[PDB]
């Protein structure tokens, strides 16, 4: 089903990310309800810097947020931003792949040969052709 694969291709990529981060000086074989708790606090955290840094820039009549709009957004969430160059500094960084694509062939749609019929003058040429 490609309908729920729109969401599950990116949420089950975040499950591999937490499973790859839990191995960084943490625990092993965590409880199941403790993983869906922490990845719910992670999605709610990205969605809160999304709504608040957009609100801080649009309050200043802008449309896309700069660095000065996020370092005020993270202050209003109590983050202590100065400790963030240290985390990135640790070599302990890992690489996880972005997800693949549901349709590899892009646009293979070629319908079928069977042109017949034209258009009456109340239908312009850019509408689809009358079928066989």
């Amino acid at each position: 089903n490609p309908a729920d694969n729109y969401h599950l291709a990116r949420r089950r990529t975040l499950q591999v990310v937490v499973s790859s981060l839990l191995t960084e000086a943490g625990f092993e074989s965590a409880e199941k309800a403790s993983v869906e708790t922490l990845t719910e606090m992670l999605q709610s955290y990205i969605s809160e810097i999304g709504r608040s840094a957009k609100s801080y820039c649009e309050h200043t009549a802008r449309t896309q947020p700069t660095l000065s709009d996020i370092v005020v957004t993270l202050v209003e969430m109590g983050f202590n931003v100065d400790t963030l160059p240290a985390y990135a500094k640790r070599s302990q960084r890992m690489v996880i792949t972005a997800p693949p694509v549901t349709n590899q062939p892009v646009t293979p749609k070629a319908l079928t040969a069977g042109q017949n019929r034209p258009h009456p003058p109340h239908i312009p040429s850019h509408f689809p052709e009358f079928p066989d």
């Binding site: 694969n5 729109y6 599950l8 291709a9 591999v16 997800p99 694509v101 549901t102 349709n103």
Partner: peptide, 9 residues
């Protein structure tokens, strides 16, 4: 280990 699903057009 479990495979990651692909993303739609």
């Amino acid at each position: 280990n479990t495979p990651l699903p692909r993303v739609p057009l």
